[PDB]
Write a protein that binds this ligand. Structure first.
Ligand SMILES: *c1nc2ccccc2cc1Cn1c(C(=O)O)c(-c2ccc[nH]c2=O)c2cc(C)c(F)cc21
Length: 563
């Protein structure tokens, strides 16, 4: 069937859309080539619509059926809880899209009578009605990139009342089932340090390793009705409350498999028969579907001793090499099997014999040295998109601060330490906002974090070595330097000067600011301060940070205030 059908009504914006980076002194201090930075808008939605619309042909075989039964046997060990309306309300982000039914995210969080009554009515409707398609809104996503343009991605999501119901029926399932089924292959259970440990150990565990990333083109569009019912068959193996079983059955047929698309103006836009990006099951469903297809395709291809690592549609496989020619042929056999399963490739996969050459989750393993000179592996990435987005977030107030999430996840990197920490600490200190909580996203869930808490967060995530790395790889330094020239970012010497300046000011303030000066900016001085374990690090409640993925799932993981 066709992934989408369209009526001809346009994908519309709900307000004026900004496509150009503003010319602003604070953003200009970070990046001078402002014309290279853009944001996608509804103006390119028709180009995306063409790319995402196609017929799917899917053929399943014994390897697919065998792997599915293995997955269901593991899912059969799970007992999932139904969340109360109150618990599900608390998981709603404060800025989540308002309902069309007279209330918004703040009313949900406050347990307002109108919000709670409506959510209850939506829940009862899921229990009683197993067929009526649930409405969804289709919007063009606003995302920032550097030139060389990408058309906007399309986001599809149901009303706020339905989103709260999805949490009640499935939040516990999507949080616990993926690890029970996929074990060590489930990417979202790892912090960045644990992910690099798993990749390095897996690589080294092979006699003669070969690895590859597999890029599925327009993955959400390749997900078929059959895939979404297979995914439901795995969820149905859980022990579930009867109302949760019915809600999952009703959501599967009424929402997850497909449904009508409405634009921001209320016009009938078309019909979806593939994965919606903005529902609670997208991350878990994509991961399960990708894992299932790839595990079966590994068997079809006769790849030896595979270890996969999956996060949504992002897949990396590390295996035992059978020789150069044999590996090349086996990878072609894998791609053919994936294509039969409706997971055709974007970039054709290539065998890699060096762990550092593999990009998975847009990141690569690199090496630096700690204060003792010992090798430390860590994950890095090309900093172009992080810097372009940091420039946009400096010029405009954005709902999510990607710069803050990038400092958290990429804290050991040369670019996050020299550029991102320096830039934002300089601005926030001048604005007396170092202690002001900001929203960021980790594995798709929203968190409210004070920048002054970064040292203990980084210590917990990455270890104290994240504050002592030096002697970065020539390849990594070259990639950063080239990026700075391309974007017009001041050279590293300028960043060191700015860092020494903000470090002095932070130390002068005492308290949490002085801890930031000591740990975050020790790289900027010769006269190193002593770095000891931070008392706050061991008390941090990081429960729920690296458990599961929630991209598009409308999840907020920070604490709810008592009433
Ligand atoms: C990686 N790749 C993905 C592809 C498709 C769907 C999901 C998915 C998830 C990842 C995991 N991952 C994320 C992320 O956004 O979930 C991040 C990340 C970066 C910056 C801010 N917040 C984040 O969560 C990752 C960082 C690193 C170093 C990873 F190895 C994996 C990450």
């Amino acid at each position: 069937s066709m992934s989408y059908t369209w009526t001809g009504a346009l994908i519309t914006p709900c307000a004026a859309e900004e496509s150009k980076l503003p010319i602003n002194p604070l953003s200009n201090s970070l990046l001078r080539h402002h014309n290279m930075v853009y944001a996608t808008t509804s103006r390119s939605a028709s180009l995306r619509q063409k790319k995402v619309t196609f017929d799917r042909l899917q053929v399943l075989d014994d390897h697919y059926r065998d792997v599915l039964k293995e997955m269901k046997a593991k899912a059969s060990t799970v007992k999932a809880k139904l969340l109360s309306i109150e618990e599900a309300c608390k998981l709603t982000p404060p800025h989540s899209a308002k309902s069309k039914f007279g209330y918004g995210a703040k009313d949900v969080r406050n347990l307002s009578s109108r919000a709670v009554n409506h959510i209850r009515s939506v829940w009862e409707d899921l229990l009683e009605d197993t067929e009526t398609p649930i409405d969804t809104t289709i919007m063009a996503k606003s995302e920032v990139f550097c030139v060389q343009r990408k058309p906007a991605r399309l986001i599809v999501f149901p009303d706020l009342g339905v989103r709260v119901c999805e949490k009640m029926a499935l939040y516990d399932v999507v949080s616990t089932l993926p690890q029970a089924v996929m074990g060590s292959s489930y990417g979202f259970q790892y912090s960045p340090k644990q992910r690099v440990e798993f990749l390095v150990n897996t690589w080294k565990s092979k006699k003669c390793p070969m690895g590859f990333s597999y890029d599925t083109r327009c993955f959400d569009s390749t997900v078929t009705e059959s895939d979404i019912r297979v995914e439901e068959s795995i969820y149905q193996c859980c022990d579930l409350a009867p109302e949760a079983r019915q809600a999952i059955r009703s959501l599967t047929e009424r929402l997850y498999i497909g449904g009508p698309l409405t634009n921001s103006k209320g016009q009938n836009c078309g019909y979806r028969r593939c994965r919606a990006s903005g529902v609670l099951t997208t991350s878990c469903g994509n991961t399960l579907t990708c894992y299932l297809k790839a595990t079966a395709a590994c068997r079809a291809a006769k790849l030896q001793d595979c270890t996969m690592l999956v996060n949504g549609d992002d897949l990396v496989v590390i295996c035992e090499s059978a020789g150069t020619q044999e590996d090349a042929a086996a990878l072609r056999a894998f791609t053919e099997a994936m294509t039969r399963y409706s997971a055709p490739p974007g970039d054709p996969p290539q065998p890699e014999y060096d762990l550092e050459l593999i990009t998975s989750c847009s990141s690569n393993v690199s090496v630096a040295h700690d204060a003792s000179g010992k090798r430390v592996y860590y994950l890095t990435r090309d900093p172009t998109t992080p810097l372009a987005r940091a420039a946009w977030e400096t010029a405009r107030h954005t709902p999510i601060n990607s710069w803050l999430g990038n400092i958290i996840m990429y804290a050991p990197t040369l670019w996050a330490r020299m550029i991102l920490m320096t830039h934002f600490f300089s601005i926030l200190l001048a604005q007396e906002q170092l202690g002001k909580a900001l929203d960021c996203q980790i594995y798709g869930a929203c968190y409210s974090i004070e920048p002054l808490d970064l040292p203990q967060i980084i210590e917990r995530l990455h270890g104290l070595s994240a504050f002592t790395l030096h002697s970065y790889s020539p390849g990594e330094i070259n990639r950063v330097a080239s990026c700075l020239r391309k974007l017009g970012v001041p050279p590293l010497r300028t960043w060191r000067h700015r860092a020494r300046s903000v470090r002095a000011k932070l130390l002068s303030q005492g308290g949490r600011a002085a801890i930031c000066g000591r740990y975050l900016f020790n790289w900027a001085v010769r006269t190193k301060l002593k770095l000891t374990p931070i008392p706050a690090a061991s008390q941090l409640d990081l429960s729920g940070w690296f458990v599961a993925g929630y991209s598009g799932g409308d999840i907020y993981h920070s604490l709810s205030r008592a009433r």
